[PDB]
Amino acid sequence: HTGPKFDIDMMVSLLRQENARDICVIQVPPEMRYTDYFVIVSGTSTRHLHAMAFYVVKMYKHLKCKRDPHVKIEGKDTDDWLCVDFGSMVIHLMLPETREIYELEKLWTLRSYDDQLAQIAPETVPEDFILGI
Amino acid sequence: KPHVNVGTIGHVDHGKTTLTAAITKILAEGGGAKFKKYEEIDNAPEERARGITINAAHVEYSTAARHYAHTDCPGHADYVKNMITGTAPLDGCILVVAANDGPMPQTREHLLLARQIGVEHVVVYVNKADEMVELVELEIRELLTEFGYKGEETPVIVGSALCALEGRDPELGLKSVQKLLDAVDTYIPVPARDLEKPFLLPVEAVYSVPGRGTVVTGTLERGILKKGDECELLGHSKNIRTVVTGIEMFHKSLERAEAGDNLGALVRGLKREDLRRGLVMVKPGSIKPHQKVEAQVYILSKEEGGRHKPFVSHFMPVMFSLTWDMACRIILPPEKELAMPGEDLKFNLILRQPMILEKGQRFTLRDGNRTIGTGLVTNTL
Amino acid sequence: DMPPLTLEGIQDRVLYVLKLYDKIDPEKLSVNSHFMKDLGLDSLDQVEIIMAMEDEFGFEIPDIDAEKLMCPQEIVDYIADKKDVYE
Amino acid sequence: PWSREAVLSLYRALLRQGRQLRYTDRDFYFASIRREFRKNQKLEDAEARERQLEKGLVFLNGKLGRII
């Protein structure tokens, strides 16, 4: 049981040996009440993504503390996007296609200041509440 | 106080753990180091790394002459895993033989793998002696000759492990452990440390800056990096001659590199397309890739999570060494039909492409996302 | 360590880094042609070039002057301030 | 932009941080910052240049999230 713990340095190196295409590991501050560390990794094919996700979870259980809760992989039915949540780490397995459309790194580095939030504007009801054509 | 690692080795019920308890017990009288209970040593703490679970008992005893670290294992299957993986490498070893049993073909494997761990200095102890004792002693010298040791200079000490632990025989039990203490202080008590060997760098990352060139990062284990050194990169049938320009540590320029440090090698006049992970950084003419390799691989038991069905020759697992991944083919040695789980034996495994494999290069064999074997290179053919 | 800062040797190492760059090729590259116009490089492109000079000689380039450095000849003159070459 | 200096300063400063990267793939980080500064720029109005610069400035700070 005793030895290596579950943390970024071990987890990333663990990913890299399965030919992780790109890795973005993001430190999340405590005010954003989600996780300590956000991770995005890309893949070559759909079956390659399953390979990685399933290795990571398998290795997790090996080094897992007894009281450390068990984890669930998400989106096995999905083609392009797979996600696994740990205690204080969150990982997203994607094609390059879905990276181009989600821009998860941009959202989490700069929150309210991203381009995607700028295009969309809040809709307000008119004064006296009368619509005109 | 110089500190080295030394570990017990031998057949089951040869009083290995009793000696381990005894050697710390006598030192407790003097108050040299912290001692553990015999029953405490019986229960080995669990160590988990690289998908391999091991019950290794570690006891720390400091003799007056030098500091020592000691390792104990409950089982033979536990013993082999420790030394093949080399989680805690041992400079010396103690071979323990029972008076009633002495040498046994099972104990042979213990000394046979000792050739592969690069240890050629051993200590023999005889226990359970409560002229027949002297009869078994001569075969041990002959046994060590077979492996490649010279049997004559090996120290063989008469005593009883239980006598030493209970302190009932000062002339037998006590005199034995002090003789063992003196024998280890005679044979390889001082550690071996040199950096004369050419440096090997498995490339962890390939990093390119325009107007700077490719930076390749790796952890040192042998050798020292210097600037302006003409160097060779080899791997995946790609061999190119180039020169080191800069070395990077803590994002600073440094002339000299040290083992156990992750250094960033700067190279010029090369393309990022050619330079990928899986490449190895060495001096030219030093080493060459070996396609066919002899190695002793421990096949994992069903208990840990190894596969239930034993494999036949021409089986194709996945070979993992350094930073490179490749699949291979295992041909089983003759007289054997299949290789059952929980049993370790030497193989001739053949890689798809010629890839570098040297002596003492630890590896794990895999099938997709599952581990079936861990092994160490015995010979390059 | 003291390297001999020969003006000719300075020129060689300056053109060495420019041929290392992807955008510009040695065919149209010359000692006297400037980056922005002649070699057809953007302002952001320039920033990377000066970084190449930054780590090579190991002396800091302030952002105030980095702007005016738009020519290889300007550079070989600028780095001549580091160690005065006459010849 | 707000200042022609400020944008070139920002492009410089960001790439300096890229050297200090530990876990994140450094080739991708550089590629991602390059293309951002390319396709967005060369075509903008005066008012939105105040916003896009600020977006980069909070990237520099990394207060809300820092890539490592």
Added chain:
Amino acid sequence: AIQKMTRVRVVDNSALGNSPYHRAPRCIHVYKKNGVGKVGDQILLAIKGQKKKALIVGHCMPGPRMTPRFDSNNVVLIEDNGNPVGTRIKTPIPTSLRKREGEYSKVLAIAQNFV
């Protein structure tokens, strides 16, 4: 509680949700043993002459104490796969969505505000 024939609000940057239309989106079906749907539950939508699956994210009916209570019925459009069609969630989502059983991680990933 969002049941059959309930008007909902699509809180996404998705084109389908934010498109101007004569009908508000209606809850066709609730994927629960009993018809009532609380937060985290999946429901089927009739928008713009098509059926679409959606995740309930906050509602007007009071819940457990420290859990937030919204003033509109907010849903996020999702594919059958589980992939959200939209890219961003402007509106805050409750944090409770995390610990609940199912595929919530992706939606959390694209959300900005937690309340």
Added chain:
Amino acid sequence: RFLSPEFIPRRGRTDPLKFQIERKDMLERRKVLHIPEFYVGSILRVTTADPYASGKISQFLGICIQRSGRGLGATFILRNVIEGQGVEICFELYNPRVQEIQVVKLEKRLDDSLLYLRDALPEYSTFDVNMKPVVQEPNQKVPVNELKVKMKPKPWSKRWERPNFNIKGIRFDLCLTEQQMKEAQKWNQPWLEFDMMREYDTSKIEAAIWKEIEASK
């Protein structure tokens, strides 16, 4: 003196011992976490531990709209419009999960409940998430906001115009008509002001609670 609403018990057939038990438990918790004097109009920022995360800290700011419950389970509800979404959270006072309660702006409104703020215009419930606390001298009368609020169109969550709600903080003139007002008057119940056995005096009760509290400290 100010006694927290929770301490004064409702009319019941509950034995006094049950209240004594609960009071002791409440008072212990008050020592650990300072409970500020706040009113229904006041603005509060509450910091809590977030169980859905690994002990990360959540703060929420909003205007109090109601304060209810008795004993340990006593509660209050905070309202606020976050970036174009109305949010209401009910908080337990004696929940161990809560880290800190601060009074950002201590004021009373005209009426004791503000649930009508849902039907009021959005801006009346929109409060800045990051605002500086504004403090007054200790021996000052608790300030009252005499704001009346403009409303949305007449379909409301409840019929506020009816005298049972007795809302004094709504600009009725703006939204309603005279005939609607006289229609609402049909539900007046004028005897109810003078019903003598309907009243609940807490004078002696509060006195005994004070005696317990001064003993505690």
